[PDB]
Amino acid sequence: LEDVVIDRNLLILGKILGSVMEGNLKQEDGTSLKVAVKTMKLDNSSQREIEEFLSEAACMKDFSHPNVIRLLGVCIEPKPMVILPFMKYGDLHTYLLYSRLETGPKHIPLQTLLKFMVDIALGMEYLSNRNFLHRDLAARNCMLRDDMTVCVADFPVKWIAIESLADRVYTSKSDVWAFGVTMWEIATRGMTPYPGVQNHEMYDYLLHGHRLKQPEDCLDELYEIMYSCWRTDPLDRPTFSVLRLQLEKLLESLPD
Numbered sequence: 001l002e003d004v005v006i007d008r009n010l011l012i013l014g015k016i017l018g019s020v021m022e023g024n025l026k027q028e029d030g031t032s033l034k035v036a037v038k039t040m041k042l043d044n045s046s047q048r049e050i051e052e053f054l055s056e057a058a059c060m061k062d063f064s065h066p067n068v069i070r071l072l073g074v075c076i077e078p079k080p081m082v083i084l085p086f087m088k089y090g091d092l093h094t095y096l097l098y099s100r101l102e103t104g105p106k107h108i109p110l111q112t113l114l115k116f117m118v119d120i121a122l123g124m125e126y127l128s129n130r131n132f133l134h135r136d137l138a139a140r141n142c143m144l145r146d147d148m149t150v151c152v153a154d155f156p157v158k159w160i161a162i163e164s165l166a167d168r169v170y171t172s173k174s175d176v177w178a179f180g181v182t183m184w185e186i187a188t189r190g191m192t193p194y195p196g197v198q199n200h201e202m203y204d205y206l207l208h209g210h211r212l213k214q215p216e217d218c219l220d221e222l223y224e225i226m227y228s229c230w231r232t233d234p235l236d237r238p239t240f241s242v243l244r245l246q247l248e249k250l251l252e253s254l255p256d
C-alpha cells in the first residue's frame with residue numbers, strides 16, 4: 001500500500017512556483033533530482049479524502065509513459081505532498097504565449113503544433129487504457145519535457161463537458177471533451193476558450209448547440225477532429241486511441 005511513501009528527510013523545499021513548490025529529491029542512487037512538490041489542500045477529520053489520495057497515488061506511481069508525468073513519490077508532514085519531476089520548460093500554455101513574442105521562442109509551425117496535440121493524445125490513450133480519468137485536462141496542465149515532448153500532468157468551467165455541468169457524471173468521454181478544448185488552445189496559441197462568452201453563460205450557450213469556433217488559418221480537417229470531441233452525446237465522441245491516430249495521420253500528411 002504505502003510503498004510510494006518517501007521519507008521527508010530526503011526532501012528539501014524551496015520557493016513557491018505556482019501550493020506547488022520547487023524541491024530537491026535525494027534518490028536511492030546517491031544523486032539528487034530537481035522536483036516539484038504539490039501540497040494538497042486536503043480534508044482531515046475524515047480519512048475518506050486521504051484514502052482516495054493514496055489509492056490514486058499508488059496507481060499513479062506505476063504509470064510509465066513518455067507522455068505522462070511520473071509520480072516520483074508521496075511525502076507527509078499532516079500535509080500530503082505529491083513529488084513530481086521538475087520541467088524547466090514549464091507548462092505548454094505559457095510556452096505558446098511566449099512563442100508569439102520576439103526574444104521568446106521561435107514562431108511555431110503547424111507541424112510542431114500538431115505534434116504537441118499528438119503527444120497529449122498518446123498520454124491520454126495510456127490513461128484511458130488504465131481506466132484513469134484526468135478530470136482537469138487543459139493546456140496549462142501539459143508540461144514540456146527537456147526534449148520538447150509534452151506530458152500530461154496535474155491529474156475551470158470552460159473545459160467541462162455539457163453532461164458533467166448538467167449532471168454529476170464524468171467519464172473518459174468528458175476527458176475527450178476537454179482534449180478538444182485543449183486542442184483549440186494550441187491552435188489559437190493560448191487564447192481563452194469562448195471569447196465574448198462568460199462563465200455563467202456557458203451551460204445555456206452549449207445547450208443551444210454552439211461550440212468553439214474555427215481559428216483563422218486552422219485546417220478544416222483539424223477542426224473536424226476537435227469538433228468530434230464536443231458532440232452532444234458522449235457516446236458519439238471518439239476514444240483517445242481513435243483521436244491519436246487521426247492526428248498522427250494528419251501530421252504525417254503535412255510536409256517535413
Ligand SMILES: CCCCNc1ncc2c(-c3ccc(F)cc3)nn(C[C@H]3CC[C@H](N)CC3)c2n1
Binds near residue numbers: 036038087088091140
Ligand atoms: C504540477 C505538475 C507539474 C510538475 N512539474 C513542474 N515543473 C516545472 C514547473 C514550473 C516552472 C516555473 C518557472 C519556470 F521558469 C519553469 C517551470 N512551475 N510549475 C508549477 C506549475 C505547472 C503548471 C500548472 N498549471 C500550475 C503549476 C512547475 N511544475
Ligand SMILES: [Ca+2]
Binds near residue numbers: 220
Ligand atoms: Ca475551409
Ligand SMILES: [Ca+2]
Binds near residue numbers: 233236
Ligand atoms: Ca447519435
Ligand SMILES: [Cl-]
Binds near residue numbers: 193194211
Ligand atoms: Cl469561439
